[PDB]
Write a protein that binds this ligand. Structure first.
Ligand SMILES: Cc1cc2nc3c(=O)[nH]c(=O)nc-3n(C[C@H](O)[C@H](O)[C@H](O)COP(=O)(O)OP(=O)(O)OC[C@H]3O[C@@H](n4cnc5c(N)ncnc54)[C@H](O)[C@@H]3O)c2cc1C
Ligand SMILES: Cc1cc2nc3c(=O)[nH]c(=O)nc-3n(C[C@H](O)[C@H](O)[C@H](O)COP(=O)(O)OP(=O)(O)OC[C@H]3O[C@@H](n4cnc5c(N)ncnc54)[C@H](O)[C@@H]3O)c2cc1C
Ligand SMILES: Nc1ncnc2c1ncn2[C@@H]1O[C@H](COP(=O)(O)O)[C@@H](O)[C@H]1OP(=O)(O)O
Ligand SMILES: Nc1ncnc2c1ncn2[C@@H]1O[C@H](COP(=O)(O)O)[C@@H](O)[C@H]1OP(=O)(O)O
Lengths: 266, 266
């Protein structure tokens, strides 16, 4: 620990089985996205904030080309989660490489993963320090913050009535999708806000209705927002598309005291 | 019927003739224009993409890049943005092109995509509305090159007499790709081409986001006409977003003209 990075490469993928395959979005979201419940036998080692690689079709032509997908489960969960938007052109029409693999994916199917990737992780002392957070996400970008939240708060899906252990840090989440029906992991987000009204705050920026996104909602709250960052030393986390970085970073008006600003973009 | 002439199993060995930095020094981006010699063995129509296989002859895994040249010219060209991330770390094919030198071998695929001009275009003087972000300009350049019969050596001959309105969104002036070519067409054919650049840097400050599709909305009354009144083929090539607020534009002032709208986003 924690040199989990690259325990399984494309040179040695890990046979895993699908355990569940669930639609993350309701009928009012244009996008299609599947949460995967993946059985790795406790063998696949990873760390909240980590991405895993899936090699489409691993047993024509090869076909040994992988895509990364952020894990959205806590280390502490028997099987692991992951969320995948199906990409189409341009329904019943055409698909991207991985997209199509996952579109035809069936339960108890072989899926081949690749060792931990990335460094978007939480701080190590975060759980004891009661450290504070500002998570910023678009679309599938919420994944890491779900895993983040399953850790900070007690996860158990089967024990959702207690207790639960509290990090009592303050967490502010800016989440931007198209509409309500397009927000990944609603059941959990709604639950977290419900169980911990003094620890988690969610700002949803919806695309539908010049254009207005999550950085624009962050500017519009810029005086309030900085408090969080400096007064509560709120840790900075950006995950999603490039565009987010500039408008939130250039709102800083610094010193390698900006450390803890984590930018991940895909 | 040139599609798939070449595949990862029989990739066409081509050679790197040139590698021009396509951006001026104010762009945060890094894009290289490759000029690739193939012995005229690559067959494609303007608007097709080709497949590049990084480090062929590890993983044999092609990425697609829009051809920014026309059939006529001896060599094919292409433009590549170099994708980066911090935690000096590069994309797979990006890293490949970045390290790419003059007279290197480069293995292409057969062609790809259906983002083409209609078969009767020059001799039907068909109108055009082209929407693009960043590298998405490539196909339209490819078009313009044919329609106007461009010859770097000679610059005139063209019979095409239609109208071409280009909407192009980029960060700032220095980020317009193929500015040379665009600026030329604007100058040489000012009653056959009209361009609308939409620079991203302007909205950084105390304003909300404004992208290429916003300009098309702000200019919505005119846009409909260009499409309705002028029997224009509409092309969108760039980011996912461009499409709904324009598409959604088209339902206001109906369908089965569908066959006149062409989309290719990534
Ligand atoms: C660090 C990191 C984390 C990531 N985490 C997630 C995540 O948590 N969840 C998630 O969903 N994704 C995530 N991604 C992106 C993920 O890898 C994508 O699924 C992948 O890059 C593209 O999907 P694909 O292979 O199905 O499509 P590709 O085969 O890569 O296709 C490329 C894109 O263009 C389109 N396209 C492809 N070929 C054509 C063609 N011939 N003509 C027209 N259009 C075409 C497709 O619709 C697709 O959107 C992450 C990426 C990174 C770098
Ligand atoms: C129809 C079509 C036409 C296209 N035409 C063009 C074109 O004209 N010009 C162009 O530039 N592109 C074009 N593309 C897309 C082109 O293939 C991209 O260069 C390619 O998708 C990026 O792959 P890569 O070589 O950067 O490596 P990849 O690894 O596939 O890149 C993955 C992305 O996530 C980042 N990333 C990779 N690994 C990690 C990691 N471990 N952690 C965090 N981030 C990571 C990279 O910065 C990159 O942005 C087109 C795509 C399609 C579908
Ligand atoms: N430049 C941008 N900055 C912030 N959010 C964006 C940007 N472009 C698109 N989005 C939005 O991010 C959300 C999630 O995107 P996705 O589901 O494709 O990952 C969508 O609501 C999308 O809105 P839009 O409807 O304008 O595309
Ligand atoms: N939702 C969106 N709709 C249209 N254009 C966008 C959107 N998000 C970003 N862009 C812009 O597309 C242009 C192409 O750049 P690239 O595709 O390399 O990011 C950029 O100026 C980028 O703006 P931004 O400056 O906000 O990133």
């Amino acid at each position: 620990e924690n040199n989990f990075i690259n325990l399984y490469t494309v040179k040695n993928p890990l046979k895993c089985k699908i355990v569940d395959k669930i639609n993350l979005v309701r009928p009012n979201s244009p996008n299609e996205v599947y949460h995967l419940e993946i059985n790795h036998n406790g063998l696949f080692k990873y760390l909240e904030g980590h991405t895993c690689g899936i090699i489409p079709y691993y047993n024509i032509k090869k076909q040994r080309c992988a895509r990364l997908y952020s894990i959205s489960s806590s280390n502490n969960m028997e099987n692991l989660s992951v969320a995948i938007k199906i990409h189409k052109y341009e329904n019943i029409t055409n698909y991207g490489y991985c997209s199509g693999f996952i579109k035809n994916l069936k339960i108890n199917d072989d899926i081949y993963l690749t060792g931990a990737h990335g460094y978007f992780n939480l701080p190590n002392d975060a759980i004891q320090k009661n450290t504070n957070f500002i998570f910023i996400a678009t679309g599938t970008g919420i994944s890491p913050y779900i895993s983040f939240l399953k850790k900070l708060f007690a996860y158990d899906k089967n024990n959702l009535y207690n207790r639960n252990s509290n990090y009592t840090g303050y967490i502010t989440i800016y989440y931007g999708v198209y509409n309500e029906d397009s927000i990944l992991y609603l059941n959990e987000l709604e639950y977290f806000q419900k169980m911990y009204p003094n620890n988690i705050n969610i700002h949803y920026v919806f695309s539908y209705k010049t254009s207005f996104y999550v950085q624009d909602e962050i500017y519009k709250r810029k005086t309030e927002f900085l408090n969080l960052f400096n007064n509560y030393k709120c840790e900075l986390y950006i995950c999603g598309l490039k565009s987010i970085r500039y408008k939130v970073m250039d709102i800083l008006k610094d010193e390698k005291k900006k450390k803890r600003v984590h930018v991940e973009v895909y």
